[PDB]
DNA sequence: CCTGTGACAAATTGCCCTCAG
DNA sequence: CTGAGGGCAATTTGTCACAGG
């Protein structure tokens, strides 16, 4: 109910140009805990195999499987920050590697350092056994937003805008025609989300002429 | 211009089993 | 017994032609 860590990051992150699976994705939850905690600093985190299967329920070999491509396929990936404003950061500088076994240890670019404490009352939070029975990575991407905006009763309202959306998410070219982000995109993340989570969510669209625009995301904790 | 759906390609899931220490 | 490995069938994604508006 609440035994997994709560998560804090600048808005910065939540609002920024990326793909990465959902298995990395679950592994940046866990760096940035790592982070969280020092006092001057560099990101070298660790990555025990043993936890990795026991805090998302998976077989010892299947575990490092995952944690064994999401670390191979970081290679090359790139995050783009904003304001306006523009710019473009490796996520890792050196591979991340195994000195005994059932260990990791990543190098984290230390230019990113800033962007995980940044600047209080300016940020994000959720509790991880949240987000953990997503298997969308982009379902993920919107649930980080509509905490964004979550106040302390559990609840909130929104509207995102879909040319914004498409561009922070980094979505498929595919989905700038709109039925098609009618099936893959929204009718599924709304559902994954609001099934997995202790959220209920609906939506309804705002035309603009001819033309859909921004979604009216609204919802209030399953408390009620 | 807008929409929804049918069908095909390509990528994911958890699952099953080998082998070295 | 743990984890660094190989493989799979089944399901979910990504693409796009077509029909009606
Ligand atoms: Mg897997």
Redesign the pocket.
Known sequence: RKNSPRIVQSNDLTEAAYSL???QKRMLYLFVDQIRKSDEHDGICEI???KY?EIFG???????????QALKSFAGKEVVFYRKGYESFPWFIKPAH?PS????SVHINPYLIPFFIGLQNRFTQFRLSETKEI??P??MRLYESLCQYRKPDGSGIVSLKIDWIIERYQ?????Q????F????LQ??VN?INSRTPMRLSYIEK?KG???THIVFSFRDITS
């Open positions: 699976s959902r298995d025990h195999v043993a299967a998976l077989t010892s070999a299947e575990a490092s499987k995952d944690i064994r195994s076994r059932g260990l990791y298997t969308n982009y379902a979505l498929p070219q595919s989905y025609r709109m039925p098609d009618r099936r893959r995109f599924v993340c994954e035309k001819r033309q859909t």
